[PDB]
Amino acid sequence: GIEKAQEEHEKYHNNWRAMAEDFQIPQVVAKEIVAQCPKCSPKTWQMDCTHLEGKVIIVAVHVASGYIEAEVLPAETGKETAHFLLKLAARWPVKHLHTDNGDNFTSSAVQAVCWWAQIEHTFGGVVESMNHQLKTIITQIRDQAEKIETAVQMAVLIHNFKRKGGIGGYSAGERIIDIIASDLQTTKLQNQI
Amino acid sequence: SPKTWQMDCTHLEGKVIIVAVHVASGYIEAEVLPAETGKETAHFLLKLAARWPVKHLHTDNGDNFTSSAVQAVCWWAQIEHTFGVVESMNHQLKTIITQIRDQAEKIETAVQMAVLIHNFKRKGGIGGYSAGERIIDIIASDLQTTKLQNQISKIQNFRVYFREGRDQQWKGPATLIWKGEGAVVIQDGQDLKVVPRRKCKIIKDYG
Amino acid sequence: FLDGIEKAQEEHEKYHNNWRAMAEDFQIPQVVAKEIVAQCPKCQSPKTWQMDCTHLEGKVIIVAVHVASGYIEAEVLPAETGKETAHFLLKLAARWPVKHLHTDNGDNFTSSAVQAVCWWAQIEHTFGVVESMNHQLKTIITQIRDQAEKIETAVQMAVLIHNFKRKGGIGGYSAGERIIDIIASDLQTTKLQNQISKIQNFRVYFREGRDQQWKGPATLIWKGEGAVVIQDGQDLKVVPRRKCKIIKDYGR
Amino acid sequence: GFLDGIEKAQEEHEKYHNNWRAMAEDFQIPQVVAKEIVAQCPKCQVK
Ligand SMILES: [Zn+2]
Ligand SMILES: [Zn+2]
Ligand SMILES: [Zn+2]
Numbered sequence: 001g002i003e004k005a006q007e008e009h010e011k012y013h014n015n016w017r018a019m020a021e022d023f024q025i026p027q028v029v030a031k032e033i034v035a036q037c038p039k040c041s042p043k044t045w046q047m048d049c050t051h052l053e054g055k056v057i058i059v060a061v062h063v064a065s066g067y068i069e070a071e072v073l074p075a076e077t078g079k080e081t082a083h084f085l086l087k088l089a090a091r092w093p094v095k096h097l098h099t100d101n102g103d104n105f106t107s108s109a110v111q112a113v114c115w116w117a118q119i120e121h122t123f124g125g126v127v128e129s130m131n132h133q134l135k136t137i138i139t140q141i142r143d144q145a146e147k148i149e150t151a152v153q154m155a156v157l158i159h160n161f162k163r164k165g166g167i168g169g170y171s172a173g174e175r176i177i178d179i180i181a182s183d184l185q186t187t188k189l190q191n192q193i
Numbered sequence: 194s195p196k197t198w199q200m201d202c203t204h205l206e207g208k209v210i211i212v213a214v215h216v217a218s219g220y221i222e223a224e225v226l227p228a229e230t231g232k233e234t235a236h237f238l239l240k241l242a243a244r245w246p247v248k249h250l251h252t253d254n255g256d257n258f259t260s261s262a263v264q265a266v267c268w269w270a271q272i273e274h275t276f277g278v279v280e281s282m283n284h285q286l287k288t289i290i291t292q293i294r295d296q297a298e299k300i301e302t303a304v305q306m307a308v309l310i311h312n313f314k315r316k317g318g319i320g321g322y323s324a325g326e327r328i329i330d331i332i333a334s335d336l337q338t339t340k341l342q343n344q345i346s347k348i349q350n351f352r353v354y355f356r357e358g359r360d361q362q363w364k365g366p367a368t369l370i371w372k373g374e375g376a377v378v379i380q381d382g383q384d385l386k387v388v389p390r391r392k393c394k395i396i397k398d399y400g
Numbered sequence: 401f402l403d404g405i406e407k408a409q410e411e412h413e414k415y416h417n418n419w420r421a422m423a424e425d426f427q428i429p430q431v432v433a434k435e436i437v438a439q440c441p442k443c444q445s446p447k448t449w450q451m452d453c454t455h456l457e458g459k460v461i462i463v464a465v466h467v468a469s470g471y472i473e474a475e476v477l478p479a480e481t482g483k484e485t486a487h488f489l490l491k492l493a494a495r496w497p498v499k500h501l502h503t504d505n506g507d508n509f510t511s512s513a514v515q516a517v518c519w520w521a522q523i524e525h526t527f528g529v530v531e532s533m534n535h536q537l538k539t540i541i542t543q544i545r546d547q548a549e550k551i552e553t554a555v556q557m558a559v560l561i562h563n564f565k566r567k568g569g570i571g572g573y574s575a576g577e578r579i580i581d582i583i584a585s586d587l588q589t590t591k592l593q594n595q596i597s598k599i600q601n602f603r604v605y606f607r608e609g610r611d612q613q614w615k616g617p618a619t620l621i622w623k624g625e626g627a628v629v630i631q632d633g634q635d636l637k638v639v640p641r642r643k644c645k646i647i648k649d650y651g652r
Numbered sequence: 653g654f655l656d657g658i659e660k661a662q663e664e665h666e667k668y669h670n671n672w673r674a675m676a677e678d679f680q681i682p683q684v685v686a687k688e689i690v691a692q693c694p695k696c697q698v699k
Contacts, residue, residue, distance in 0.1 A: 012565045013543060039543055066570050069244070086302065090309035091222070091244070093325065117309070126570070140416055140442060150239065157243035157270065164421045167571055167581050173246065174336055181333040184326060269414065343424075399591040650691035650698045 001025050002033075009033055013040060026190055042183045043095035045088070048127045049076070049102070052138070053148055058084055061130045062092075065175035068130060070156050072149045078107030085110065089117040093180070096120045134159060195335045196248040198241070201279040202229065202255070205287065208300055213241055214282050218327035221282060223308050225301050231260035238263060242270045246332070249273050286311060353379050356392040369395060401627065402638045404428050409636075412436055416443065431596055431622055432629060432636070439634065446586045447499035449492070452530040453480065453506070456538065459551050464492055465533050469578035472533055474559050476552045482511030489514060493521040497583070500524050537562065599623070603649035604630050606639045620646065654681045658689075665689055669696055 001023045008014060008023075016030035023030075034040055047060045056073040058081065069088060073080050081104045088094060097119045099105040105123070114121050137155040145151045160172050170178075200213045209226040211234070222241060226233045234257045241247060250272050252258040259276075267274050289307040297303040316323050322330075352366040355377075367381035377393045379386060404426040411417060411426075419433035426433075437443055451464045460477045462485065473492060477484050485508045492498060501518070503509040505527050518525050540558040548554040563575050602620040606628075607613070618632035628644050630637055657679040664670060664679075672686040690698045 012561055014565060018567055064570070064572070083301070083305075086305045086309075090305045090312065093313065116306075149236070153236075153239045153243050154269075157239075158415050160243065161246065162415045162417060162421075164424075165418075167573065167577070169420075169424075174340075177329055177333050177336065181329050184329070399588050400595075650687060652688075652692045 002029060005030060005033055009037060013037070017041075041096060042179050043093060044098065045094055045096070046098045046127050047085075047105070048100065048131065049073075049104075050131055052135070055148055057152065059127070059131060059134065060084075060088055061127055062176055063126055064179055065172055066126075066130065067172045067176040068134065068156055068159050070134065070152055072152055076104055078104045078109050081105070082107070082109035082113045085119075086113050086117070089113070089119065094119055096122070098122050098124060100124055194249065195331050196246055197251065198247050198249070199251045199279050200238070200258070201253070201283065202226075202257075203283050205290070206300060210286075210304065211237055212279060212283055212286065213237075214279050215245075215324075215328055216278060217331055218324050219282070220324045220328045221286065221308055221311050223286065223304055225304055229257055231257045231262040234258065234260070235262035235266045238272075239266050239270070242266075242272060247272055249275070251275050251277060253277050350397075352396055352398045353377065354394045354396070355379060355381075355388045363394070366398065401428075405432065405629075405636055405638070408433065408436060412440065416440070429622055430592060431599065434592065434596065435621055435631070435636070445500065446582045447497055448502065449496075449498055449500070450502045450530050451489075451509070452504065452534065453477075453508075454534050454538075456541065457551055461555060462488055463530060463534060463537065464488075465530055466496075466579055467529055468582055469575050470529075470533070471575045471579045472537065472559055472562055474537065474555055476555055480508055482508045482513040485509065485511070486513035486517045489517050489523075490521065493517075493523060498523055500526065502526050502528060504528050601649065603647050604628065604639075605645045605647065606630065607643045609643075614645070617649070654679065657681045658685055661686065661689055665693060665696075669693070672698060 002025065005019045005023050005025060008019065016027060016034045019025065019033070020027045020030040042064050044063050045060050046063055047058070049056060049058050051057070056076050058071050058073055060069045061067065062069075071084050073084070085097075094117070097114065099121070101123055104110070111121075113119075134155055137158050138151055141154055141158065142151055145154060162171070164171050195217060197216050198213055199216060200211070202209060202211050204210070209229055211224050211226050213222045214220065222244075224237055226237070238250070247270070250267065252274070254276050257263070263274075266272075286304075286307055289310050290303050293306055293310070294303055297306060312324050314323070318327070349368060349370065351369040353369050354363045354365075355367060356363060364381075367379040370378040370380055370385070372378075372395065373390075375390050377388050377390060377395075379388060379393075405428060408422050408426045408428060412422065419430065419437045422428065422433040422436065423430045446468060448467050449464055450467055451462070453460060453462050455461070460480050462475050462477055464473045465471065475488055477488070489501070498521070501523050503525065508514070509527075515525070517523075537558055540561055541554055544557055544561065545554055548557065565574070567574050569578075599621070600619060602623075603617045604620050605614045605617060608615060616632065618630035618637075620628070621631055621636070622629040623646070624641075626641055628639050628641055628646075630639060630644075658681055661675045661679045661681060664675065672683065672690045675681065675689065676683050676686040687698055690696055
C-alpha cells in the first residue's frame with residue numbers, strides 16, 4: 001500500500017486523505033508522503049451573513065454534507081455572532097471554522113469563543129448556493145407564517161429533511177450523521193490497530 | 194425508542210430555562226426563555242424539530258405545554274405529543290453551571306458552556322462514550338436498517354442485456370441481482386444464472 | 401394506492417417536495433407525482449459552455465468549461481484566427497451536446513467562420529468561472545511541468561489530473577462523475593415528458609357507483625391493469641377499469 | 653411522395669372545410685395526418 005501510494009503521488013500528486021481512503025493506510029503515513037514531496041475534513045463549518053426584509057440572518061453550513069443552520073439576529077454586532085458560534089459549538093463537534101473578510105468576524109468576543117472552544121479560524125463556492133436555495137424556500141412558504149423567524153425555521157426544516165437531491169439521493173441530516181459516525185469508527189479502528 | 198424526546202422547564206436565578214432531553218442517549222439541548230408563554234415554547238420546539246428528527250414528544254400537564262401554538266407546531270411538523278430523567282438532568286446541569294460560574298458574566302454563556310461540557314466532556318457508561326457519540330450511533334443504526342430495506346429494490350430496478358454461448362444476438366432485459374468483479378447474477382424468467390462481466394450490458398433504459 | 405395519492409397531495413401541500421422523492425416514498429408511479437408537481441401554482445443549465453483564450457510560454461491555449469460541473473477541455477492553437485476557433489468549436493460540438501455558448505467580445509469569437517459553425521450546429525452564441533479555471537489549470541501546469549518535453553503533453557496531463565484526480569464538493573466526486581450525472585438526469589426528464597404527452601392524448605368517460613349515466617370527459621393520467629387515474633375539476637381520482645371507456649380526443 | 657399533398661390538403665381545408673376521409677381519398681395522404689388537419693381547425697369536429 002505504501003509503495004502504491006508513493007507511485008500514485010509521484011505521478012498525479014494526490015492529497016493524503018484520498019490516498020488513505022483509496023489505499024487503506026493510516027493517515028500519518030500519507031501525511032509524511034505528502035510532506036516529503038518538494039513540489040507540494042468532517043469538522044469544517046463555513047459561516048456567512050445576509051440581509052432579508054430588513055433583518056440580519058446568519059447561516060452556517062457543514063461543507064461535507066450541506067447541513068444548514070440559520071438564525072435571525074437583532075443586530076450585526078460581535079456579541080451576538082459569538083453567542084451563535086457558542087451555540088453551534090455546544091450542539092455539534094466543530095473544529096475548523098471558515099469566514100470571509102468581514103467586520104463582526106474579527107472581534108474580541110469571537111476570538112475568545114474560538115479560543116475557549118479551540119476552533120481554527122480561517123479567513124477568505126458552496127455557501128452562496130446554500131443561501132440561494134434558502135432564499136427560494138423562504139419565498140416558497142412565506143405565506144404560511146406571519147413572522148419572519150418562523151418562516152426561516154420552517155425553511156431550515158424543509159431544506160434539511162425534505163429535500164432528497166444530489167447523486168446518492170440522500171438528505172442532509174442523514175449525510176452528516178453517516179459522515180460523523182463513519183469518521184468516529186475509522187478513528188477508533190486506527191487508534192486500536 | 195430512537196426518536197423520543199422529553200421536555201421540561203425550570204427556574205434558575207429568577208430566569209426560565211427550558212431543557213429538552215433525548216432519552217436513549219442522555220443528550221441535552223437547553224435554552225433561556227424570557228417568559229413562559231406558548232409562543233416561545235412553540236419556537237423552541239420548532240427549532241428542536243428542525244435540527245434533529247423528533248417524532249415523539251413527552252411532556253407533563255403544564256401551562257404552556259397545552260396550548261394552540263404547541264398544538265399547531267406539532268401538527269405542522271407531524272410530532273406525536275404525549276402527556277404524563279429530566280429532573281436528574283436538571284440537577285446535573287445546575288451542578289455544572291455552579292462549577293463553571295466564575296468564568297462567565299451572564300447566565301446565557303454559563304448555560305451554553307454547561308451544555309457543551311455535559312455533551313462532549315463527560316464520558317461514562319459501559320463502553321466509555323459521551324452523549325453525542327451515543328446519539329449519533331443510535332440514529333445511524335436505525336437509518337441504516339430502513340434504508341437497506343429500500344436499497345435492495347433500488348438495486349433490483351436495473352436492466353441487463355446478456356449473451357449466451359455460441360449465439361450472436363443479445364438476449365432480453367433480465368433483472369440484475371448482484372454485480373461482482375468478474376461475474377453478474379441475473380434473474381431471467383424466474384431462473385437465476387451467472388454470466389461473466391464481459392458478456393453483459395447494464396443500463397436503466399428510460400423508455 | 402388512493403391513500404398514497406392523498407398522502408402525497410397533503411405532503412406536497414405542506415412541504416412542496418419534488419416528484420422523485422414522492423415517487424420513491426409513497427410508491428406512486430412517476431407520471432402521477434409529476435402531475436401533482438405540475439398542478440401546484442407555486443412551483444411554476446445542463447447544456448451551457450463558456451469559452452476563453454490565454455497565453456502560456458508563447459503558446460495560445462483555448463479553454464472551454466462546462467459551467468454546472470466544472471469540466472475542462474483545452475487545446476493548443478497554432479494561431480489566433482477565426483478558422484481555428486471554429487474548428488475547435490466544431491470538435492467540441494461533435495463530442496458533447498452543446499446548446500448555449502458564452503464568450504467574450506474578442507476578435508476571433510466575432511467572425512464569419514464561427515457564426516457559420518454556430519448556424520450549422522444550432523448553437524446560441526452570447527457575448528458577455530473561466531478565469532478561475534485558467535488560474536487552477538496554470539497552477540497544475542507549473543506543478544507537473546518537469547515530466548513532459550513539449551507543452552501540449554503538459555496541457556493534456558493537467559486536463560486529466562483536473563478532471564479525474566481532484567475530488568471535492570458536497571459528495572466528494574470529481575468533475576467527470578458530476579457532468580455524467582447531470583446529463584443523465586436531463587435525459588430521464590425528457591423521456592418522461594414524451595411518455596406524459598403520449599398518454600395525455602386520450603379521454604375517459606366513467607360511470608359512478610349506483611348510477612347508469614356516464615359522467616364528464618376527464619383527462620387520463622395513468623392506465624393500469626385494473627385501475628385508471630383521471631383528472632377532473634382539479635381533482636385526481638382512481639376508478640376501476642370495468643366502469644370506464646377510453647376514447648381518443650382530437651382537441652388541439 | 654405526399655408532402656405536397658399535405659400542403660394542398662391544408663389549403664383545401666382552409667377554403668372549403670372538408671372532412672378527413674374525403675381528403676385522404678383525394679390527396680392520397682394517410683388517415684392520421686388527415687385527421688390531424690381536421691383536428692387543428694377550431695370550427696370543425698372530426699366525426
Ligand atoms: Zn507531491
Ligand atoms: Zn408545489
Ligand atoms: Zn375547418
